[PDB]
Amino acid sequence: ESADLRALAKHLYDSYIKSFPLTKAKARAILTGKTTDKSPFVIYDMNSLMMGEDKIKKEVAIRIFQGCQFRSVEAVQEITEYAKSIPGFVNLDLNDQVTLLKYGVHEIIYTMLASLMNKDGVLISEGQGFMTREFLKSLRKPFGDFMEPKFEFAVKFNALELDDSDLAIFIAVIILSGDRPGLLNVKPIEDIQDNLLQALELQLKLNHPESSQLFAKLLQKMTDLRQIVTEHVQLLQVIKKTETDMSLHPLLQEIYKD
Ligand SMILES: *C(#CC(=O)[N]C1=[C][C]=C(O[C][C][C])C([C][N]C(=O)C2=[C][C]=C(C3=N[C]=[C][C]=N3)[C]=[C]2)=[C]1)C1=[C][C]=[C][C]=[C]1
Incomplete structure (x- = not known):
């Protein structure tokens, strides 16, 4: 039933609003200079x-x-909360649960970080601030180009003109990718994604009727994402040896062990 799909879609968009305090709709009101109370x-x-540091809430490159x-x-944390709401997710093998988040977290972070970027820079601290692409880019080696690729992906991605309701489905699709390393039972995962894919299909058709083949255009972006991730991990590994005086958070470091 398509109705069954639209209901999944409302459900998801709902959880998305609940889990993610800075939506793309809000981000864009801030970046388009909408109002006089929201100016970063x-x-x-x-x-x-x-x-x-006075108006919003060691070394410079390092503190950034x-x-x-x-x-x-x-x-x-945010994504983990969302994940729990995805129909089926919590019922899966627990060791699978961990796996799906472990590989899905970064690819989601970059998707949603695009919401906060435009070609000139990126929103920080819940929209209170805005750090220009150029400043980031002038950051010493090797922190110069840790953000560069993300901009590149965002500008391409943002041109598809997705909105929050589209994205909620799409980050659900990412989480439930049956092709992740160390997955115990793949089938049950793919059956959930099948539904998610199905929802997203309908969603995009309804929401963007004049956007031809968007659905496929969106699905191929998953390759750019993965690319960004691997470039990330690599860059961190150099960070960790130049900067033996620099810490990584425990949660983060669990994600990085391969
Ligand atoms: C990345 C992204 C960002 O650049 N995010 C970001 C970057 C820099 C700053 O601040 C730099 C100095 C002003 C911030 C601001 N937020 C914090 O660093 C921060 C906020 C709150 C707290 C805190 N709150 C309460 C109690 C105690 N501490 C501490 C620190 C944000 C990036 C790259 C790749 C992927 C995703 C994101």
């Missing part, structure tokens, strides 16, 4: 960084990087 502090140089690190722990 703009961070584009070192004194702006300084003053920005750990600024992402605590963030990503937050995201993981």
Whole structure:
């Protein structure tokens, strides 16, 4: 029943709103300069960084990087909450549950981080601030280009013009990918995704009727994502040897063991 699908879609979008305090709709009101109460502090140089700690809530490149690190722990929490709401997810093998989040967390983080970017920079601290692409990019080696690729993916991704309701389904599709390393029972996972894929199909058709083959165009983005992830992990591994005086959060480090 399509009705059965639209209901799954409402359900999902619902959980998405509940789990994720900074939606893409809110992000874009902030980035388009909608209102006079939502205007971010703009961070584009070192004194702006300084003053920005006063208006919004060790070394510079390092303080920024750990600024992402605590963030990503937050995201993981968020995603974990969402995951629990996906029909079936919690019933699966527990060792599978862990696996799916372990490989799905980053790919989701980058999908939703795009919501907060535009071609000039990225929103930080729940929309209170905005760090310009150029500043990030001038960050010393090897922190210069830890964010560059993410921008590239976002600008491409953001042009598909998805909205929150589309994304809720799409991050559910990611979580339930039967092709993840160490998965115990794959079938039960794929049966849930099949439904998710099915929902997303209908969703995109209804919501974006003039967006031809969007559904397939969206599905191929999963390759760009994976690419970004591997580039990430690699970059971290160099960070960890140049910077033996630098910590990684426990939750984060569980995710990284392969
Ligand atoms: C990444 C992304 C971001 O860049 N996110 C980000 C980056 C930098 C900062 O701040 C830099 C100094 C101003 C922030 C702001 N948030 C924090 O660092 C932070 C907020 C709150 C707390 C705290 N709150 C209550 C009690 C105690 N502490 C601490 C720190 C945000 C990135 C890269 C790749 C993927 C995703 C994200």
